[PDB]
């Protein structure tokens, strides 16, 4: 379903980073990653079979076979990780942006869980794989250590299902609300986090978190994957909550010297402010 390109047609510009290697650059802006060594071919081709079927707003759009190369939509905004924890100066964002991002993420993952004949599992949902465009207001996923966002049945070898992507989304929800790195204090190598999560450890709960949001977030954290909601249920819930989070379309433009309080009492302070939420919620309820 794709569209070949002549390699001479592309004009390289700059380098971006490694997920292969991605480079900035066609027909008057695109992002491309050339393959390195034949070991990645057998995977590189799969991505092609997948992305060519995919067509969704919140998933990176896939626009050469000699040399093997991909030409994808360029995300001028960068990764969500760089927005939350990247280089100074960091941008200010609101509760509306946190919820909007997560919603758009669930929208894109639900489209994957609905593909026929078989569903597609991302299996590596984390902010570094979530790109932003339109002034940081639109989120797009790119399938192309993940211990913090990995469901406990995944790294235990148990035959997992798409519900592993739900667990990740739940962690991503806690990350944008607190603007913290999940299990940053644990540290050490990857296995020290797997042991913690495997034992039931989850991120600390959030002061003043709305019970509707605290409920959904933890339901996604449940050990039993069958007690986790489906993405379709997340999309629906998140869609209805956006009614209490206006201003998602406002771009990121203001800086933010952000102080990080330490995790005191196993209960952290959110970065976003839920004042406007409770206010709008009292209006409808009463």
Ligand X SMILES: C=CC(=O)Nc1ccc(Oc2nc(Nc3ccc(N4CCN(C)CC4)cc3)nc3[nH]ccc23)cc1
Q: Does 86 bind ligand X (CB under 6 A)?
A: yes
The distance of closest approach from Cβ of residue 24 to ligand X in the complex, given in angstroms and rounded to an integer, is: 7
Q: How far is CA 160 from CA 52, 72, 150, 163, 204, in A?
A: 25, 29, 11, 8, 25
Nearest to 129 by CA among 115, 108, 143, 116: 143
CA atoms within 13 A on the CB side of 142: 26
Q: Does 75 bind ligand X (CB under 6 A)?
A: yes
Task: Report the Cα 104 to chain-centroid distance in Å.
Answer: 9
| Single residue of 5, 20, 22, 54 touching ligand X by CB under 6 A | 22
From the list 50-58, 71-79, 148-156, 256-264, the region that binds ligand X by CB under 6 A is 71-79
CB nearer ligand X, residue 96 or residue 142: 142
Q: Does 125 bind ligand X (CB under 6 A)?
A: no
CA distance 193 to 145: 10
* Catalytic choice (6, 29, 124, 184): 124
Q: What is the helix (H) or strand (E) element at residue 45, kind and residue range?
A: helix 41-53
CB nearer ligand X, residue 19 or residue 263: 19
| Single residue of 19, 135, 210, 212 touching ligand X by CB under 6 A | 19
The distance of closest approach from Cβ of residue 73 to ligand X in the complex, given in angstroms and rounded to an integer, is: 6
Nearest to 151 by CA among 126, 133, 119: 126
CA distance 111 to 123: 14
Mark whether 124 is an active-site residue: yes
Q: Using CB under 6 A as the criterion, which residues of the chain lie in contact with ligand X when the complex forms?
A: 16-17, 19, 22, 31, 60, 72-75, 78-79, 81-82, 86-87, 128, 131, 142
* Binding-site residue positions for ATP: 16-22, 33
Enumerate the active-site residues: 124
């Amino acid at each position: 379903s794709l569209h070949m390109i002549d390699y001479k047609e592309i004009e390289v510009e700059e380098v971006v980073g490694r997920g292969g290697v991605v480079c900035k650059a066609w027909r008057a802006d695109v992002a491309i990653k050339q393959i390195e060594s034949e070991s990645e071919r057998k995977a590189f081709i799969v991505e092609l079979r997948q992305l060519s079927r995919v067509n969704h707003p919140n998933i990176v759009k896939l626009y050469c076979l000699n040399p093997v190369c991909l030409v994808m939509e360029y995300a001028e905004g960068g990764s969500l990780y760089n927005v939350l924890h990247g280089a100074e100066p960091l941008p200010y964002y609101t509760a509306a942006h946190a919820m909007s991002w997560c919603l758009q993420c669930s929208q894109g993952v639900a489209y994957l869980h609905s593909m026929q004949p078989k569903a597609l599992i991302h299996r590596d949902l984390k902010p570094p794989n979530l790109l932003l465009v339109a002034g940081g207001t639109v989120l797009k996923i790119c399938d192309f250590g993940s211990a913090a966002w990995m469901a406990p049945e995944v790294f235990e070898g148990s035959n997992y299902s798409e519900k592993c992507d739900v667990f990740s989304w739940g962690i991503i929800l806690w990350e944008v609300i607190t603007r913290r790195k999940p299990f940053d204090e644990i540290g050490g190598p990857a296995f020290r986090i797997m042991w913690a999560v495997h034992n039931g450890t989850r991120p600390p709960l959030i002061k003043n978190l709305p019970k509707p949001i605290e409920s959904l977030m933890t339901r996604c954290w449940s050990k039993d994957p069958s007690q986790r909601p489906s993405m379709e249920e997340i999309v629906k819930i998140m869609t209805h909550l956006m009614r209490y989070f206006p201003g998602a379309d406002e771009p990121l433009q203001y800086p933010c010297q952000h102080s990080l309080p330490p995790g005191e009492d196993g209960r952290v302070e959110p970065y976003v402010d839920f004042a406007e939420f409770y206010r709008l919620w009292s209006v409808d309820h009463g």
